Paper text:
The [name] ([name]) is a receptor tyrosine kinase that couples the binding of extracellular ligands, such as [name] and transforming growth factor-α (TGF-α), to the initiation of intracellular signaling pathways. The extracellular module of [name] consists of four domains, denoted Domains I, II, III, and IV. Domain II, which bridges the ligand-binding domains, contains the ‘dimerization arm’, a loop that mediates the principal interaction with the other subunit in an activated dimer. Domains I, II, and III form a compact unit that we refer to as the ligand-binding ‘head’, and Domain IV forms a rigid and elongated ‘leg’ that connects the ligand-binding head to the single transmembrane helix.
To test this hypothesis, we examined an oncogenic variant of [name] seen frequently in cancer patients, in which a leucine residue in the activation loop of the intracellular kinase domain is substituted by arginine ([name]; this is residue 858 when the signal sequence is included). The activation loop is a key allosteric control element at the active site of the kinase domain, and the [name] mutation promotes the formation of the catalytically active asymmetric dimer of the kinase domains, leading to hyper-activation of [name]. We carried out cryo-EM analysis of full-length [name]([name]) bound to [name], using the same procedures as for wild-type [name]. The two structures representing the tips-juxtaposed and the tips-separated conformations of the [name]([name]):[name] complex were determined at resolution of 3.3 Å and 3.4 Å, respectively. When the angle between the heads is at its minimal value (~10o), the flexible leg swings maximally toward the ligand-binding head, increasing the distance between the membrane-proximal tips of the extracellular module by nearly 15 Å (the ‘separated’ conformation). Although the oncogenic [name] mutation involves a residue that is located in the intracellular kinase domain, this mutation markedly stabilizes the flexible leg in the tips-separated conformation of the extracellular module on the other side of the membrane, compared to wild-type [name]. The cryo-EM density for the flexible leg is much better resolved in the [name]([name]):[name] complex than for wild-type [name], with secondary structural features clearly visible. Thus, activation of the intracellular kinase domains by oncogenic mutation preferentially stabilizes the flexible leg in the tips-separated conformation of the extracellular module, providing direct evidence for conformational coupling between the extracellular and intracellular modules of [name]. Our cryo-EM analysis of the oncogenic [name] variant ([name]) show that the stabilization of the flexible Domain IV leg in the separated conformation is correlated with the presence of an oncogenic mutation that results in increased levels of kinase activity.
Residue numbers in the entry:
A (entry chain A), B (entry chain B): 1 to 614
C (entry chain C), D (entry chain D): 5 to 51
Amino acid sequence: LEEKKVCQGTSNKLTQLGTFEDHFLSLQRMFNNCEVVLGNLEITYVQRNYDLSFLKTIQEVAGYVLIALNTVERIPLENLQIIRGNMYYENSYALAVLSNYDANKTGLKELPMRNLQEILHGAVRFSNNPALCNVESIQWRDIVSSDFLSNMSMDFQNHLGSCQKCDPSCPNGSCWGAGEENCQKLTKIICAQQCSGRCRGKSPSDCCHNQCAAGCTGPRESDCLVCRKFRNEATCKDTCPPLMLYNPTTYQMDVNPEGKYSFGATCVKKCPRNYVVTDHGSCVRACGADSYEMEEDGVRKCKKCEGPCRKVCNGIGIGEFKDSLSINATNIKHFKNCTSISGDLHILPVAFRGDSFTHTPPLDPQELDILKTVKEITGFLLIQAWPENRTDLHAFENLEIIRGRTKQHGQFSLAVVSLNITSLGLRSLKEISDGDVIISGNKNLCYANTINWKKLFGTSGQKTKIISNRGENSCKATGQVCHALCSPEGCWGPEPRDCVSCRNVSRGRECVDKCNLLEGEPREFVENSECIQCHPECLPQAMNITCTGRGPDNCIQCAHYIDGPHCVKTCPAGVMGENNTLVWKYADAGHVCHLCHPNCTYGCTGPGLEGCPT
Amino acid sequence: LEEKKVCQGTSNKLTQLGTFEDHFLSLQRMFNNCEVVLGNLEITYVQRNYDLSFLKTIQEVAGYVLIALNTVERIPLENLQIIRGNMYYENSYALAVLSNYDANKTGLKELPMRNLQEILHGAVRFSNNPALCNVESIQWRDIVSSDFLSNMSMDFQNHLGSCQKCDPSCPNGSCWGAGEENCQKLTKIICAQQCSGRCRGKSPSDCCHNQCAAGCTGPRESDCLVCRKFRNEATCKDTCPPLMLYNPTTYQMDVNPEGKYSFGATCVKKCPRNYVVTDHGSCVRACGADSYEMEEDGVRKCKKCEGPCRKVCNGIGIGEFKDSLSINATNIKHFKNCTSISGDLHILPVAFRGDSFTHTPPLDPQELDILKTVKEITGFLLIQAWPENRTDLHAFENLEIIRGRTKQHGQFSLAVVSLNITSLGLRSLKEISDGDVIISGNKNLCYANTINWKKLFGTSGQKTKIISNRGENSCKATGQVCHALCSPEGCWGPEPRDCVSCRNVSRGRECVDKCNLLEGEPREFVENSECIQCHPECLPQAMNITCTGRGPDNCIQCAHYIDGPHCVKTCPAGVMGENNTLVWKYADAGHVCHLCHPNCTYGCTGPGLEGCPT
Amino acid sequence: ECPLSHDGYCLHDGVCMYIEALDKYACNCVVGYIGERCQYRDLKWWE
Amino acid sequence: ECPLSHDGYCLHDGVCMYIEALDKYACNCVVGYIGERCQYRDLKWWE
């Protein structure tokens, strides 16, 4: 596996997922055989005789690393190498060990974290481990970032001393718990005076590259162990090589034969489909308010918006929506005219039930119709509660596409679980670009197995999980099946409004069998199996088709007066026109209109001036 | 102070600008008080006993160096550090010294180029100058680049022994001149193996930043002597600090307070007021393949090509114009319909003559009517020839503006020299922005000393050179004074057709004494000294003004009816609306237009049904 | 236990436990729900 | 003088000399005209 098997990492930090055996199995499958934690590394609440031998593969972490409240023996984190600390525990620390003991003080004995060599951000903390040995003689000035040394909070009293001292073969006997290889291997406070960063020896000829984050095998950028910034499957760069160089000999941007895009932290050749490309060459999730995503054939970047600008709308979890977790009955008014949603949408029963802890009143169950104007979701849609009165998602009937930028769980982009709704109600879903979808745990819900989700999925690799829904025969042998005046597949409910494709004509939206070609007062005409209404001013042809399109010249026999390519109810009778002149017609028996004699302004009725008074 | 005193450098490969005495005046008029040669340096045909003492302050040459064919004895280039050999002499050499000897085997003896450290691009050539001494033992591997070791041919015929031998206190007898100071100080092949290039010594901490080009003081970047790339006014970077930086956590772009525009081998806080800013803030000459221009609040961005974006035309020299030196009669066809010449125009008397050297036939004078559609010249305009029978510049009608991206001799954009023409032939020239004007040498050309160029020059500091052009005395006597009615600031010609702006105001293509405000037949308003007629629907105001704009929205009182903001002749009665529903309105008391009842089909003469009777 | 201040702090029928050592409050999420306040629902393993 | 092959090479009334050392040809521009073959007119100093 050239690419590192990534895992998601928890974000609970103070919770119990069931019972002790339940907390450990959930933690097991969550971290079993993963080599990069893209989140946090809570290892809380393990107990004696369990096995944490599956932590022998964690190599990097992208957030704080909590280890708290677990009475257990060694936690074999013998391969952690860097804690990028992108998010701090308690706003300060990035490796926080707190209270690893019982009411008998037989807690966390040892912690062979030997390979840890840099914590790119945040302080550290090691409080209250009554039986913890040799994690008191380590250099918290070599590992910790040289800025946060004021927030360190080491405090420990191993007043139940039972651990030996280890082989005296490494600096100051700085030992990570036992043995000789189990002791420190530092690479910052033995480097030469003229070393840029870390090193590998003591000579001034062996400083490491300026972009390595924990030691290096060689003196070259292609020899770092962990890239401090963007990587390239190669030399750990500092910023992806731009697309166009400058060539200051001739003042014009000459392109680069090695330009690549910055996808978070990587240099890729091309941005993914669901990601906004930028002129700078950087896959992003959105762009400034002075723009909007103009589709450019799958390379859909965003240009400046001229004059009025499209109403982009920040979803939940971003910006000011941080202390909120669902659509409280205080942040619902902020979705009034949001035709799109930059972010994602959460609906949880706390909104309808009311949160005293957050001090938000319950939500008006009918206020959800404000979300009707929503047309595109950038992230995911998570629904876990809808009022029992309504029988369908009566607020997302206009939703068109779910991009899938910031997807839930690193997973499913549409989640409708634990509902009581008979018909789904998403009549306008056309594509879900990237993600997955689960609709399950709905007793009285059907029509969800008829749709062909395989078409709605943009990229390849997505998959659905639809179980626990109302059974096949409980729907089949009760009448509530797919409509007969609809496609053999792709239907969202009984009513004619919503069943995707049609086998016959359709009044714009509704699949019907036969529209008004021969009878009916508003007549229509079929084009590409979508018949559209036409003028009433044409004559109703009781024999054949009564119009040949939409415009006025498409009346088989226009019952009113015909002026060349135009027939109207009454031919113009003094309409102001172009070139600053007046168009004046008249009426006769043969029912044709021609220009009047320009003598009388009042308009003629016949030849010359005899009809109109002069 | 942070800038030096630059000079443009010669380009005459091996010519002789006169005799030996008036050639030297061409050397010292341009290389006096230089600090950095922006072009090339060529010392040729300097005779014995001539004083070369201004060559002391030359510290950097942006091209090549040619010291050939002279019989001076001492050339004190005792401050030359780096030869960033952009241009190549003989397409292979960046420093050539040939045939510096007169007939009797004597000539150039010394060359104190002791400070010469690096030659970024190019080679060195020494041949047939049997008087130069002590420069034969100079080890060249230290100065030239790495690869340039097979094309730097050299030979030294110094066998006279007439120069004092080298001082035995120098690194292996490598001395440029005589004395302890004049000795080659190696800084490329003496220092430690683990150095990144330049190195002011041998200690492993002496290695210099890889962005110093001719040695350094310390291992920092702000201590380079001369640098290989951009200059952020204190340091010497590789690429300018971008305006906006990525963010590996939020997938966004963050504004960089250290924002610098890559303005041609130096970072600047802001592009010049006449340059086209690229999307990622980099001053360039003109964006190419498919784009536009955009004068938004001065910042001349260029957005994109869409649809029929016409072709842009490259000036002389650049592109496929390297061979020819003017618009000769073999390339004027490529200017068939160029409407904005992104470059420069050269009119040389070789055009109308035709040379047997480049085999270009003589140009037909009437061919110059092709340029009658050249609406824009971004660079400079050198007018140096014009057929005698023509009375003025007929081709370039208005030009409207010359920007001045590049210039002639680095100072001049407009050049009118030695023309027998009688008139200018440039009747708008509204916004000349960069450069000076040389309008002189025309023996018969009046009405030139009336145009107030301060009203035209955008940049502050430009000046005029209107001298010796049919002196203004008696121009009035011979009748050549321009039209005696238009407000005197302009008049490139003797007709009222072409004057700065106009007598007072103008009615399209004609000047007038005053707009038709208050009275007149057509009501008018004033903006930019132009008279535009009010909308026919504004009422003739015999008291005050009539309107404040073209549209019926700016009327003080409508003549007939008033449909909301607009002044209409007759309230709408058949205008297309929403949902294909027609529109019928009526005039009430104050002639205000209100809509009909949704029912009234043939219209209504009153509100609701009580208005449209049977 | 948790006092008369964190009532309803634990969503989805979650009991509120008290950590006296850290002086911090934490839920005991019933099986199935995750998150700091048991607000989410574990989809990757069940419905 | 250069042979009957580079006639008309030197614009603006300049002579065509044969450099006997380098084996090259080059102009001798009269006062005022600068350039490889005397094309331009020195604008910074005269008219």
